[PDB]
């Protein structure tokens, strides 16, 4: 189950989706290992 204070958030206003650390302020699309490469 992924790290505390992170969520998925939309791209372009209307496109796809980024993945954001909310408590730090860090924008990416990619997983910090608490959910892995496949699971």
């Amino acid at each position: 189950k992924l790290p505390p204070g992170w969520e998925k958030r939309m791209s372009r206003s209307s496109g796809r989706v980024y993945y954001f650390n909310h408590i730090t302020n860090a924008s990416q699309w990619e997983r910090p290992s608490g959910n892995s490469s496949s699971g």
Binding site: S11, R12, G15, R16, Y18, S27, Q28, W29
Partner: peptide, 10 residues
């Protein structure tokens, strides 16, 4: 870039 997916924001 301009149509923003934010991974490379410049």
């Amino acid at each position: 870039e301009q149509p923003l997916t934010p991974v490379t924001d410049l």
